[PDB]
């Protein structure tokens, strides 16, 4: 699908109760999964750079951004919000 194993990406904080920020991350595994209505949807196991594997989280495509100038800009912008 949109991202592939090995790919370096940006990924949203997987924990809802925490500041919405973007972490540098890596696709560890992809997996065809299934929506509530049985449609094939991809799932992505994500590794958070600089944290060890025990921090790896399953995330929906929604939650994973391409490592792009524009997404990096969005990273910095969310990073400032969270500190302030």
């Amino acid at each position: 699908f949109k991202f592939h194993s090995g790919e370096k990406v940006l990924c949203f904080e997987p924990d809802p109760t925490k500041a919405r920020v973007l972490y540098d991350a890596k696709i560890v595994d992809v997996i065809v999964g299934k929506d509530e209505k049985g449609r094939k949807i991809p799932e992505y196991l994500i590794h958070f750079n600089g944290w060890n594997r025990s921090w790896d989280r399953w995330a929906a495509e929604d939650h994973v951004l391409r490592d792009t100038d524009e997404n990096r800009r969005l990273q910095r912008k969310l990073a400032r919000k969270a500190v302030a």
């Binding site: 924990d15 109760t17 925490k18 500041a19 920020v21």
Partner: peptide, 5 residues
């Protein structure tokens, strides 16, 4: 219960 603010 997780990580950083």
């Amino acid at each position: 219960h997780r990580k950083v603010l």
